[PDB]
Design a protein around this ligand. Structure first.
Ligand SMILES: *[C@@H]1O[C@H](CO)[C@@H](O[C@@H]2O[C@H](CO)[C@@H](O[C@@H]3O[C@H](CO)[C@@H](O)[C@H](O)[C@@H]3O)[C@H](O)[C@H]2NC(C)=O)[C@H](O)[C@H]1NC(C)=O
Ligand SMILES: *[C@@H]1O[C@H](CO)[C@@H](O)[C@H](O)[C@H]1NC(C)=O
Ligand SMILES: *[C@@H]1O[C@H](CO)[C@@H](O)[C@H](O)[C@H]1NC(C)=O
Ligand SMILES: *[C@@H]1O[C@H](CO)[C@@H](O)[C@H](O)[C@H]1NC(C)=O
Ligand SMILES: [Cl-]
Ligand SMILES: [Zn+2]
Lengths: 188, 595
């Protein structure tokens, strides 16, 4: 059987960047022709391996990470970036070997009243290690007086919502991102 | 340190304010393009939530010790949030002060005056009174419109402006200011880098000092126009006295533009008003803005976003809605850029499209700055950035290359005096009017003019500074200052003086980087990706660096300069001194058309 990339790319619902989910790809032949013979993607940026040698290559397993960031936040899904998404939400290793794909989704992920489902982490003590995931809603304590569970002055709730609206600029529109990691069962 | 604690505090503000400011900005757009009593609340309540947030964060940032910061971006972000604001006022005196501002704004807009010869006709300021003051040649008709506005809607503003002064003085005095006049001068204040600081009182000294190199040019334009006005209104004007206030082309004399029909040097020549050419080529509002879009990309600047082309109101609503037809350039945030303008197929609205789209380019560039630093360098930077666009868009070299003027249009040495004269009636004519107005309110806020002689000293300054005399005597029941919009609607007015000097400092520096070769008034920076990048560098700056620095990055000066403006009108200045050899340059502050 061929690998189910349709279960991740054309998936109806996408998770937030802070709670991004990962799918492991096992014993299956992969079909990279549909991702390549389509201009549907807005970016399609590869790292560590070329965009055309993965066809006649084999990998130990493939991991697909899917999530949603704003228009201007896509550049941080790259090895060695220091934004809020890269440092507090999703950090890629410097030796990442794979491709990052993104496409505009204002028509599906942005409603008139603002889609406040997609969120991201804004505050965190220390940065995220490569491929780490943090989903805690514990009140971020910026000061010395303890929060005691209740947020407020110098005690800010960590996660904030994007709030996508169709009237926003293209740099503030929802983009669905998929990160295909190659680790060294899956061939072409 | 209080550094990271304020660092990770302005970040909480930058994310919570951008959402609230959009709820408030999108509310103002929905009212101005669909006037509804429901939208009045949406425009107010969605702004009131934003009005309560800015006060909480202003107070919370005041806890953070300002000096204990070592990085300059954060230093500049805090001081913008360190302002106490207007909530230092009492609970009820805030509501009465907030209510008199509506009553002044309403009687300024609802203000109707009725004709004694025809009582069924009653006119508004727009388009009723402004059309008389801008086109009538009857001394008595123009006098009626000038006086009826200052005696009927002007006298209603007298009791309100008296309380308007006393209440907003109590607001500024509690915020460590001398008066409401000192409150506005804080715009140009800089307390930072060595060699870039600027005092609030330094602003008063600078507008006066630079005004002296303007008096030579203005006195001769006054003498030339007065000689031309003695022909249109014979036996009414003294060849040595001031100009009557109602003959100056509009309601207040703010611009002498409409006097061009009476003061044209060589009217026998073909007119440069290209309004007819646009109409017979089937131009619409799309063609104006689409053509204006092509102007900005020709220098490397980005196209208008597709959200601009879909969310902007570039026409009168047509087939449903009520609209505030004032042209405005709107920066809602989150990349949402819109322009609201009831565009007509004319040259005047064609040049304004370059001005308003110029604002958007300034807005688009500094979008990378933090939310607190997304603003002009000072109050006069935005209006000067839009004017340099229309200066390049009005040149004959630009109009023909666009296809509007004929390729064989003769650009004589006289067609340029005709052009620079019309430019002088609009650009330099408004300079003494602007200074006298803001100097008067500066002194009234200062308390130097007692309320029992507000109007006596106002006209003593009109004759001395502007060379304009009142046609009928006014006692203290009148309130001619508040007869202007910016005065009765709580708006600073010195910005129009500062922006005017800036727009020629920029034009001089930009055409030098664009390598223009003829006179400055003939410069068109189209196709100048070289000069475009020079301007881009200060557009991205925003409110981060002081205005003394942002100005220095392009013009090379730490302060405003009058030398660029005088060089622009140098062909006209020397031509006026030839005309006025048998004329009287200057005026007597003692003649009045009644006495
Ligand atoms: C620099 O600015 C000038 C002024 O607008 C631009 O020149 C104009 O360029 C257009 C082409 O887009 C020329 O139209 C041409 O007309 C001839 C008919 O004579 C036609 O056969 C061609 O196919 C073409 O459409 C236009 O004549 C020309 N006018 C002038 C005064 O130069 C030029 O595009 C700008 N360069 C940039 C922005 O790089
Ligand atoms: C998603 O649907 C499109 C519809 O044309 C299809 O071409 C594409 O292959 C689908 N995605 C995947 C990953 O199969
Ligand atoms: C004007 O506002 C009303 C809300 O009172 C809204 O129902 C209507 O659709 C608006 N007009 C247009 C043209 O959308
Ligand atoms: C214009 O040029 C003509 C011929 O060169 C000259 O006689 C005339 O005095 C000039 N007038 C102006 C106003 O420049
Ligand atoms: Cl007046
Ligand atoms: Zn403007």
């Amino acid at each position: 059987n061929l690998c189910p990339f349709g279960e991740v790319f054309n998936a109806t619902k996408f998770p937030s960047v802070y709670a991004w989910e990962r799918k492991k790809i096992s014993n299956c032949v992969a079909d990279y022709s549909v991702l390549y013979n389509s201009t549907f993607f807005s970016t399609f940026k590869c790292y560590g391996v070329s965009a055309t040698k993965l066809n006649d290559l084999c990998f130990s397993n493939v991991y697909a990470d899917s999530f949603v960031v704003k228009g201007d936040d896509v550049r941080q899904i790259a090895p060695g970036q220091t934004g809020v998404i890269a440092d507090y939400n999703y950090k890629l290793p410097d030796d990442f070997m794979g491709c990052v794909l993104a496409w505009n989704t204002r028509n599906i992920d942005a409603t008139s009243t603002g889609n406040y489902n997609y969120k991201y982490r804004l505050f965190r003590k220390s940065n995220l290690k490569p491929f780490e995931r943090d989903i805690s809603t514990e009140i971020y304590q910026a000061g010395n007086k303890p929060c005691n569970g209740v947020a407020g002055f110098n005690c800010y709730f960590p996660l904030r919502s994007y709030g996508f609206r169709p009237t926003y600029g293209v740099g503030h529109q929802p983009y669905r991102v998929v990160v295909l990691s190659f680790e060294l069962t899956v061939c072409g | 340190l209080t550094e990271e604690n304020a660092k990770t505090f302005l970040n909480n503000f930058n994310q919570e304010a951008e959402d609230l400011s959009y709820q408030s900005s999108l509310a103002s757009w929905n009212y101005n393009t669909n006037i509804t009593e429901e939208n009045v609340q949406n425009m107010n309540n969605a702004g009131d939530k934003w009005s309560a947030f800015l006060k909480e964060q202003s107070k919370t940032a005041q806890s953070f010790s300002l000096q204990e910061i070592q990085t300059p971006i954060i230093k500049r972000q805090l001081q913008a949030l360190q302002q106490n604001g207007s909530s230092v006022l009492s609970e009820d005196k805030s509501k009465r002060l907030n209510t008199i501002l509506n009553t002044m704004s309403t009687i300024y807009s609802t203000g109707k005056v009725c004709n004694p010869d025809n009582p069924q006709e009653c006119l508004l300021l727009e388009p009723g009174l402004n059309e008389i003051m801008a086109n009538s040649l009857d001394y008595n008709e123009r006098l009626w419109a000038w006086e009826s506005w200052r005696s009927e809607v002007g006298k209603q503003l007298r009791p309100l402006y008296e309380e308007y002064v006393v209440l907003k003085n109590e607001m500024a005095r509690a915020n460590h200011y001398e008066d409401y006049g000192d409150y506005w001068r804080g715009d140009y204040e800089v307390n930072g880098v060595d060699g870039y600081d600027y005092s609030r009182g330094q602003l008063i000294e600078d507008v006066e000092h630079t005004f002296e190199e303007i008096k030579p040019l203005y006195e001769h334009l006054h003498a030339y126009v007065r000689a031309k006005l003695m022909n249109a209104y014979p036996s009414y004007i003294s060849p040595i006295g001031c100009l009557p206030a109602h003959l100056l082309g509009d309601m207040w004399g703010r611009f002498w533009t409409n006097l061009y029909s009476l003061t044209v040097p060589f009217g026998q020549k073909p007119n440069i008003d290209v309004t007819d050419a646009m109409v017979d080529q089937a131009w619409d509002a799309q063609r104006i803005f689409k053509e204006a879009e092509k102007f900005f990309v020709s220098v490397g600047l980005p196209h208008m976003t597709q959200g601009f082309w879909a969310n902007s109101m570039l026409t009168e609503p047509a087939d449903g809605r009520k609209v505030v037809c004032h042209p405005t350039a709107w920066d809602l945030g989150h990349g949402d850029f819109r322009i609201k303008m009831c565009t007509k197929v004319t040259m005047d609205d064609f040049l304004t499209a370059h001005h308003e789209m110029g604002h958007i380019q300034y807005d688009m560039a500094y979008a990378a700055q933090p939310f607190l630093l997304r603003n002009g360098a000072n109050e006069g930077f935005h209006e000067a950035v839009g004017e340099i666009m229309s200066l390049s868009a009005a040149t004959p070299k630009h109009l023909k290359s666009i296809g509007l003027l004929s390729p064989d249009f003769q650009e004589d040495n006289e067609t340029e005096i005709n052009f620079l004269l019309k430019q002088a009636l609009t650009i330099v004519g408004t300079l003494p009017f602007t200074y006298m107005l803001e100097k008067w309110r500066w002194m009234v806020f200062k308390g130097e003019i007692p309320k029992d002689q507000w109007m006596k000293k106002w006209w003593e300054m009109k004759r001395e500074i502007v060379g304009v005399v009142e046609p009928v005597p006014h006692d203290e029941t009148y309130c001619d200052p508040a007869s202007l919009f910016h005065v009765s609607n709580d708006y600073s007015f010195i910005r129009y003086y500062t922006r005017t000097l800036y727009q020629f400092q920029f034009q001089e520096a930009l055409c030098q980087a664009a390598k223009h070769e003829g006179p400055l008034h003939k410069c068109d920076i189209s196709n100048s990706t070289e000069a475009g990048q020079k301007l881009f560098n200060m557009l991205r700056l925003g409110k981060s660096e002081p205005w003394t620095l942002a100005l220095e990055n392009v013009v090379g000066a730490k302060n405003m300069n009058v030398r660029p403006l005088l060089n622009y009108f140098e062909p006209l200045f020397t031509w006026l001194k030839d005309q006025n050899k048998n004329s009287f340059v200057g005026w007597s502050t003692d003649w009045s058309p009644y006495a």
